[PDB]
Task: inverse folding
């Protein structure tokens, strides 16, 4: 009987616990003796599982926490709109896209910062944005700032509502464990209402607002002169005139004469030649189909009527010879452990954000997106990152489940058991495959560097000398361009020009063109696949042995987060699952960093540039295929040559990127102090300094203590990532903008 | 193997025996302390040197000390 | 019935007997190979193993080498004859350290009866293998360039 | 031994509270060596607020 | 009082894991654990895996004494049982280990004289110039 | 159904020869005689460190010292006139 | 070309070959 | 430009000497570890207990001091 | 509100209500007295 279950007024709402830091744990509530206290209370702030054993209280905490998050995000979205309304060039940008640089930030005039307000066009002085909002706005049919203001105020209200919601569903009406466990209902409602009705109603916006307004703009008519989007609704005469099938109304819909809607619901593909973005008509039909798919999909699982599948039944059904009892027991786990769910969800979200980057790379869905190289590089790099992080996080929490929630006695599961029983083979094989991959990828580059140094170019791995052709990839590319003829007849052009031909260009710039694949590409992909396999090695090893190993059989009792178990057994540094996540972050950074470098060099050399007399001049003149085969080529043709614009960014609008360039190196290097050292030194240092304080009667009551080993590692990895990422960030953006 | 010693500052709170993963220490009667008992290390050939014992000691300064010494197959935590 | 089971009855031994490891076949093929045979003297095993690698090393140093674009197979010939002679140093030096007093193997069979111990591991054992790896290797190398060349 | 609750300086050099002040909790009247049980306001590294000391390793000041 | 006899009794249910024995058990010293489990209830394999206990006498096979004292403390704390455990050698000999004198080491038992027990404060150690020209260390004086 | 026996000291730990079948010689009468006699003088281990090392150096010092363009591009040498340096040098 | 044809490959291989050989036997035995 | 760099070098000097001198004087004993002299010049640590004792030995002090050598010169 | 004010007098809150003050002060003084290398 799936039903609404709630506790009434479980927690009073006075500031009695605000004024008591570390209320949430009996340990911290006692107060600080040492400075370590300060760290601990922030470390364990959101760690609800260690606070209480009650799954109810945890469950109430988690989403109210999520209502708070959503409030924050709305406020963030509110921000962008408002600035896009108040402090921007958008209207100027809604009249000559080609010759205005998108800007939605102004600096105040003090302290020389004025120079950051650069010559961005439309008679406006400011910071060029690379978020890609201006194109979203054109895609949504936004024409005037007023509209942006109104959207902003709405987001602020929504922020208020989400904050209210979060206080409410903890302090007045907190749902019961039973509630949260209605997985079938949750799944159905999220699939059908959220995604389904979401893309359906959106598709409503697209068919009634986006499509018409876009055609008039692409026609060239002044945006001020364009009819307002409500008058499109009440005067369909304008819609009839733009697409004829509106004359027949919703009659063709009910009568199944859908072919009459071929005016605005297309399958053409390729790019809109006047704008370098996907057809909005393709997108409208995309969302229409997707809405139906999700809507019917969201009616799979059993709720308050006999009809529908039960998750536990499907799970208990699915067993075979090699696995024994199979999926049995998994439902119960995945209805009692937030960690396990978090682990799943982070892996697939993360994977999703990376596929989003690519698919946005290959199929620019917004107007004048493709030709704003700054925006395109920013978005692909960004989304590639957040994915990166989320995937490592999936590994982290998987291990946390493995240590804190796994209990075979109470909640048995055999798939898991069988995995545990042969972990050694898995990890050893991953080890092997990784050494393989490392040698046969890096080794190729070292081989090339050596042959190139020894004067033997004919012996190199390159299109000229050695051929390592991506035959499969070329096949699939072959199949993709020929598909509109044979296997997808109703489709006019290809999904993407990076498979097909037809080089489409806007404003003298290349929007998209066929991407050639040679030996250099063979190289970098196998480097990737190496990096991913190593990251998986570290993280999987971390999760599978989180509980026990040959060295430390009782690791499970010691925790998820802990430094070591001493210098015994020869020495046991970095045994914990946390330490695996630790090292996993570095390799992830490594992998992701070569990807975006791959992306940037690839794009500037083989794709992007200007279009002259029946011909193309690329930004870096197709050096990739010949230069990216050696380490020296990256060192010189990518790093050294490209860093030019960042290193001389001084005295300009882009100088902030030079400052951040240096600052990010600083902070990166600064991490190494924490990573390379240990708190034994620091604590003795602190002993001497404390002496000095006491000598002058200026010693603190909160006894000054060096960071824990774990915190040293966390600070280390954090500053390492922030430094690295911020440096690449200042690099690309100054580079691609200039 | 590693050397493990117990000094006379021992209170005999027994945490160091109860903490050990390889059973090196034991409690013996004595005449020095309020608890009438003291810690002892008769099995140091099985000592790994992981220093849980030390971490467990309440005395100031610690009344167990582990001096990492000549290393043998057991002290190196080997199962292979 | 479970496809995968404990190791020869014992479930507390570091292994899992899959249809990959233990089966009607695999237990018959691996015993057919030179090294795993128990009853044979230590001379003939090393030759049957040693020869084989002389052909696995032979193909390689012909077509990928520096003189691949030309003395291409004379080049590839004695280079396969080399990893042979180094293995012989590796296997003679491997032997020099290990065996001081008597052999050391899992004495019994799967049936469990105390079968005679193999000379695979002994003082006079690895010598005739190290010899087999040489005479097999050096001669076995020659026949990948009496057939591809001469 | 010292009177209960008296402020006492530590003179054992290997202590975390060496040359520092503590209060006497109870001096055990027996044949024990370290009878003077002292408690301090500030903990050591090992999360301990209290220790045992001998009669020559305290000075009431 | 007498140390345990070393009989043949059946090990508890287990599909098998890779974490278990290797070459060390064959040519070095492996380890054996003994206890009387009341009912059939599941336990954590310290070398990885789920395994069901059987009623009556149960014995396990491990290659390190940590894998015993991780399990024993997991058998002693959770189920509240009491296991004995001892070594094995590859010529067929045994070394009785735990509990060595029937009593577990944490609570006091007569007839266990003190070993490696220094009878001074640690700061009353001599400086390591006064232990050169020897094979001695800093604590044993 | 008990894997715990002090008298059975080999079955206990699991030292089972996994695929070590005790079958007869499938190897031929004429051919096994060809390759016993042929590989019996090189048999001894002391003779290998005398043969393989010194005759192996005699294999490197033969095909190593034997000096023209025919086989390698260094004994070939410089076949063009010297290039001009940075500080007006030869 | 007389001297360095001999002394380079002997110092390159034949010195480390018997050094790695005779130092291995010193370690293990 | 000469002015700044010499003070950078002075930073180099004083800090490296801080590591080395501190390592020398606390080689014998500290409040965290009064009996350090019983262990000697290189040791991994003294365990994870009472806070954690990584890179506690004078050995490790010199190790840390090398990095500043390198940076300074 | 005895409780609410104790929270406002918490370390992280005071720091921020202190730094926005001594930041403004220094931005402010750099406005009406712009670009100093003396005084
Ligand atoms: C030439 C190429 C290199 C070839 C070989 C060296 C590579 C391998 C070195 C790694 C091994 C380090 C090590 O064994 O690790 C541990 C060692 C030894 O530690 C000792 O470990 C000992 C082990 O004890 C055991 O052994 C003892 C006897 O040895 C006793 O038996 C004892 O009871 C028993 O417990 C003790 O515990 C000692 O207390 C402890 O000090 O650490 C140390 O002291 C290190 C040894 C002293 C090194 C001297 C300082 C070097 C500083 C260099 C700075 C950079 C210079 C670069 C210049 C570049 C210019 C271009
Ligand atoms: C996460 C969201 C976010 C972020 C990061 C920023 C960031 C910024 N805003 Mg703000 N802004 C936001 C949301 C956001 N805004 C929202 C929700 C509103 C109300 C709808 C505003 C309204 C606003 C105004 C009115 C001004 C700023 C200004 C600024 C800049 C100076 C900050 C300051 O005054 O000190 C800074 C870049 C100032 C600026 O650009 O100069 C400025 O004048 N913002
Ligand atoms: C002494 C150094 C100094 C000072 C006094 C200021 C002061 C200020 N900067 Mg900053 N700024 C500085 C250096 C400095 N800046 C440097 C080095 C950079 C380059 C990294 C910038 C880049 C920068 C930006 C991009 C912006 C500010 C803005 C601001 C103002 C609001 C920031 C806030 O609280 O949010 C504030 C008056 C914000 C503004 O003008 O509004 C704003 O958007 N600054
Ligand atoms: C049509 C109804 C509907 C819709 C549109 C949504 C939409 C949403 N739910 Mg869901 N939810 C629903 C029914 C629905 N829910 C039902 C019936 C249940 C089970 C009783 C849940 C239980 C649930 C939980 C437990 C959580 C959400 C959360 C969310 C948000 C996820 C983040 C996002 O996509 O933004 C999202 C707004 C998350 C949130 O509030 O943030 C969250 O933690 N939902
Ligand atoms: C929505 C996602 C999400 C959520 C809610 C959590 C929640 C949590 N994480 Mg986290 N984690 C995440 C993503 C997430 N993680 C990601 C993306 C990563 C990759 C960097 C990690 C990596 C990570 C580590 C390494 C650790 C946690 C830990 C924690 C806990 C303490 C956090 C705190 O209070 O500070 C808490 C249960 C800590 C724990 O012990 O649990 C811990 O050590 N997480
Ligand atoms: C250029 C520098 C460098 C080099 C040459 C290597 C080389 C290697 N690392 Mg990596 N590693 C590096 C930097 C480097 N690492 C750094 C900076 C860190 C610190 C985060 C690590 C942390 C690290 C881990 C944690 C692992 C590797 C692994 C490996 C091995 C991968 C298998 C292979 O290719 O063979 C290999 C030996 C993997 C392995 O063991 O295989 C592995 O799991 N490395
Ligand atoms: C896995 C990496 C890799 C790969 C695939 C190759 C592949 C090749 N190398 Mg090698 N080489 C490598 C790494 C690698 N190299 C490295 C790391 C070095 C050290 C710098 C060299 C140094 C080297 C030399 C000196 C020569 C080759 C040559 C060759 C060719 C013949 C080798 C043979 O048949 O055996 C072949 C195409 C030979 C050739 O003719 O080309 C040759 O003269 N390589
Ligand atoms: C230091 C000793 C040493 C010596 C004596 C040699 C000698 C030789 N090497 Mg080289 N080589 C060396 C180190 C050395 N190498 C190292 C350390 C590497 C690994 C990086 C290689 C990798 C290498 C390759 C891959 C190839 C050679 C080849 C050759 C031959 C080139 C000239 C010819 O055609 O005859 C020659 C026999 C080529 C060959 O034998 O043909 C060849 O293809 N060498
Ligand atoms: C806390 C430090 C601080 C200080 C010392 C000052 C001081 C001053 N501010 Mg204020 N100001 C501050 C923070 C501060 N401000 C902050 C936090 C903001 C927004 C984030 C502003 C925004 C602001 C504006 C917009 C104006 C002033 C103005 C002034 C001047 C008042 C002139 C008048 O009333 O006649 C005065 C010098 C007025 C001015 O300069 O004229 C004025 O109109 N201030
Ligand atoms: C330097 C260093 C320290 C010592 C560094 C410390 C303790 C960092 C924290 C210092 C900051 C500055 C203290 C925070 C002070 C508060 C923010 C309040 C300041 C008051 C106002 C100015 C705001 C370690 O603890 C450590 C641990 C493990 C490995 C490496 C290292 C390491 O390298
Ligand atoms: S811990 Fe320190 S005190 Fe408690 S027993 Fe072991 S030694 Fe005596
Ligand atoms: S972490 Fe610091 S303490 Fe724990 S072991 Fe490694 S070094 Fe010794």
Result:
């Amino acid at each position: 009987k799936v039903k609404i279950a709630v506790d009434r007024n479980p927690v009073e709402t006075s500031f009695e616990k605000w004024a008591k830091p570390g209320h949430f744990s009996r340990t911290l509530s006692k107060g600080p003796n040492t400075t370590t206290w300060i760290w601990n209370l922030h470390a364990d702030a959101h760690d609800f599982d260690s606070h209480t054993s009650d799954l109810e209280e945890i469950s109430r905490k988690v989403f109210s926490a999520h209502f708070g998050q959503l409030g924050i995000i709305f406020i963030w979205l509110s921000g962008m709109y408002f600035h896009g309304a108040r402090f921007s060039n958008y209207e100027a940008w809604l009249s000559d896209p080609t010759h205005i640089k998108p800007s939605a930030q102004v600096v105040w005039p003090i302290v020389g910062q004025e120079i950051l307000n650069g010559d961005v066009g439309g008679g406006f002085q400011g910071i060029q944005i690379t978020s890609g909002f201006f194109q979203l706005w054109r895609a949504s049919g936004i024409t005037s700032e007023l509209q942006l203001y109104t959207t902003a105020i709405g987001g602020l209200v929504m922020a208020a509502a989400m904050f209210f919601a979060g206080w409410f569903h903890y302090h007045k009406a907190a749902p019961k464990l039973e509630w949260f466990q209605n997985v079938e209902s949750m799944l159905n409602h999220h699939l059908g209402g959220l995604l389904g009705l979401g893309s359906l109603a959106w598709a409503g916006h697209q068919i009634h607002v986006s499509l018409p307004v876009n055609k008039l703009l692409d026609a060239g008519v002044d945006p001020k002169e364009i009819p307002l989007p409500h008058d499109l609704l009440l005067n369909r005469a304008i819609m009839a005139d733009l697409y004829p099938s509106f004359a027949k109304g919703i009659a063709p819909f009910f009568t199944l004469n859908w072919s009459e809607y071929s005016d605005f619901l297309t399958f053409k593909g390729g790019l809109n030649p006047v704008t370098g973005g996907l057809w909005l008509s393709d997108t409208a039909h995309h969302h229409v189909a997707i809405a139906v798919l999700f809507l019917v999909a969201g009616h799979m699982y059993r709720t308050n009527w006999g009809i529908g599948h039960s998750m536990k039944e499907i799970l208990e059904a699915h067993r075979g010879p090699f696995t024994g009892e199979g999926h049995v027991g998994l439902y119960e786990i995945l209805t009692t452990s937030w960690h396990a769910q978090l682990a799943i969800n982070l892996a697939l979200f993360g994977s999703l954000s990376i596929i989003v980057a690519h698919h946005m790379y290959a199929m620019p869905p917004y107007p004048y997106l493709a030709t704003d190289y700054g925006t395109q590089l920013s978005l692909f790099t960004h989304h590639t990152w957040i994915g990166g992080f989320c995937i490592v996080g999936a590994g982290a929490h998987a291990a946390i489940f493995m240590v804190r929630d796994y209990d075979p006695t109470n909640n048995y599961n055999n798939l898991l058991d069988r995995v545990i029983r042969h972990r050694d083979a898995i990890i050893s094989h991953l080890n092997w495959v990784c050494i393989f991959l490392g040698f046969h990828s890096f080794g190729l580059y070292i081989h090339n560097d050596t042959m190139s140094a020894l004067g033997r170019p004919q012996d190199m791995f390159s299109d000229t000398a050695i051929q390592l052709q991506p035959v499969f990839a070329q096949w699939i590319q072959n199949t993709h361009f020929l598909a509109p003829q044979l296997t997808a007849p109703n489709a006019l052009a290809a999904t993407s020009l990076t498979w097909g031909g037809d080089l489409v260009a806007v404003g003298g710039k290349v929007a998209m063109m066929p991407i050639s694949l040679g030996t250099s590409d063979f190289m970098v992909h196998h480097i990737h696949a190496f990096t991913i396999h190593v990251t998986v090695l570290i993280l999987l090893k971390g999760v599978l042995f989180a509980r026990s190993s040959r060295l430390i059989p009782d690791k499970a009792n010691l925790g998820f987060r802990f430094p070591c178990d001493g210098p015994g057994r020869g020495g046991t540094c970095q045994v914990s699952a946390w330490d695996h996540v630790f090292l996993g972050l570095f390799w992830m950074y490594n992998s992701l960093s070569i990807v975006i470098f791959h992306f940037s060099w690839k794009m500037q050399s083989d794709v992007w540039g200007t279009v002259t007399a029946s011909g193309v001049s690329h930004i870096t003149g197709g050096n990739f295929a010949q230069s990216a085969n050696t380490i020296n080529g990256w060192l010189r043709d990518f790093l050294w040559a490209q860093s030019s614009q960042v290193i001389q960014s001084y005295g300009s609008a882009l100088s902030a990127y030079g400052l951040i360039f240096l600052g990010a190196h600083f902070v990166w290097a600064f991490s190494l102090m924490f990573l390379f050292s240990g708190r034994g030194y620091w604590q003795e240092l602190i002993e001497s300094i404390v002496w000095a304080h006491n000598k002058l009667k200026v010693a603190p009551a909160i006894q000054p203590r060096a960071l824990s080993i774990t915190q040293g590692r966390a600070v280390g990895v954090a500053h390492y990532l922030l430094g690295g990422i911020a440096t690449t960030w200042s690099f690309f953006l100054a580079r691609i903008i200039s | 193997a590693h050397i493990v010693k117990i000094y006379d500052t021992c209170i005999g709170c027994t945490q160091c025996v109860r903490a050990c993963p390889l059973d090196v220490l034991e409690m013996v009667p004595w005449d020095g302390c309020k608890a009438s008992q003291m810690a002892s290390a008769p099995r140091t050939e099985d000592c790994v040197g992981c220093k849980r014992c030390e971490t467990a000691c309440p005395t100031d300064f610690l009344s167990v000390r582990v001096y990492l010494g000549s290393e043998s197959t057991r002290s190196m935590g080997l199962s292979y | 019935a479970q496809v995968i089971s404990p190791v020869n009855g014992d479930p507390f031994v570091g292994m899992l007997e899959t249809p990959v490891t233990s089966a009607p076949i695999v237990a018959t093929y691996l015993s057919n190979l030179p090294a795993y045979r128990t009853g044979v003297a230590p001379v003939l095993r090393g030759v049957e193993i040693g020869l084989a690698h002389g052909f696995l090393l032979a193909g390689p140093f012909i077509k990928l080498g520096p003189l691949r674009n030309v003395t291409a197979e004379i080049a590839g010939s004695l280079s396969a004859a080399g990893l042979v002679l180094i293995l012989a140093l590796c296997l003679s030096i491997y032997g020099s350290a290990q065996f001081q007093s008597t052999p050391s193997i899992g004495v019994k069979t799967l049936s469990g009866r105390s079968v005679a111990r193999d000379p695979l591991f002994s003082a006079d054992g690895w010598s005739e293998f190290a010899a087999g790896f040489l005479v097999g290797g050096e001669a076995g190398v020659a026949w990948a360039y009496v057939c591809t060349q001469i | 031994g010292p009177k209960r609750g008296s402020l006492v300086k530590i003179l054992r050099p290997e202590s975390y509270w060496f040359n520092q002040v503590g209060k006497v909790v109870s001096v055990d009247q027996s044949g024990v060596r370290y009878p003077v049980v002292v408690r301090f306001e500030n903990q050591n590294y090992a999360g301990v607020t209290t220790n045992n000391y001998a009669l020559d390793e305290v000075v009431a000041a | 009082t007498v140390p345990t006899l070393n009989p043949d009794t059946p090990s508890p249910i287990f599909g098998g894991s890779t974490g278990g024995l290797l070459r060390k058990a064959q040519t070095e010293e492996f380890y054996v654990i003994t206890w009387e489990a009341k009912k059939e209830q599941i336990f954590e394999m310290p070398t990885g895996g789920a395994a069901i206990m059987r009623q009556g006498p149960n014995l396990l096979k491990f290659g390190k004494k940590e894998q015993c004292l991780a399990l024993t403390t997991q058998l002693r704390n959770k189920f509240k049982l009491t296991p004995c455990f001892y070594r094995v050698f590859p010529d067929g000999k045994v070394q009785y280990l735990h509990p060595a004198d029937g009593v577990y080491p944490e609570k006091v038992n007569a007839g266990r004289v003190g070993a490696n027990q220094n009878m001074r404060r640690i700061g009353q150690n001599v400086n390591p110039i006064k232990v050169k020209f020897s094979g001695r260390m800093m604590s044993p004086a | 159904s008990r894997y715990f026996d002090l008298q059975d000291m080999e079955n206990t730990t699991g030292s089972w020869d996994m695929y070590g079948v005790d079958e007869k010689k499938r190897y031929p009468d004429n051919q096994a005689k060809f390759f016993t006699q042929a590989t019996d003088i090189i048999s001894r281990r002391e003779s290998l460190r005398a043969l393989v090392a010194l005759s192996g150096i005699a294999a490197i010092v033969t095909y190593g010292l034997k000096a023209k363009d025919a086989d390698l591009p260094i004994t070939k040498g410089p076949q063009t006139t010297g290039e001009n340096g940075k500080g007006g040098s030869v | 070309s007389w001297a360095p044809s001999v002394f380079v490959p002997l110092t390159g291989l034949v010195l480390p070959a018997i050094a790695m050989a005779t130092l291995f036997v010193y370690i293990e035995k | 430009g000469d002015f700044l760099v010499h003070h950078a070098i002075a930073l180099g000097l004083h800090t490296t000497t801080l590591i080395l001198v501190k390592g020398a004087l606390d080689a014998r004993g500290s409040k965290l570890m009064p009996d350090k002299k019983d262990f000697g010049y290189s040791f991994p640590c003294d365990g994870p207990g009472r806070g954690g004792t990584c890179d506690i030995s004078a050995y490790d002090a010199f190790y840390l001091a090398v990095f500043w050598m390198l940076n300074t010169i | 509100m005895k409780d609410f004010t104790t929270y406002l007098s918490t370390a992280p809150v005071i720091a921020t209500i202190w730094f926005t003050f001594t930041a403004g002060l220094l931005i402010e003084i750099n406005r009406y007295f712009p670009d100093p290398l003396v005084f």
Summary: Residues 1-80 of chain B form one domain. Residues 15-19 of chain B form the longest helix (5 residues). Residues A 63, 66-67, 70, 179-180, 182, 185-186, 189-190, 193-194 surround chlorophyll A (ligand 4) (CB under 6 Å).
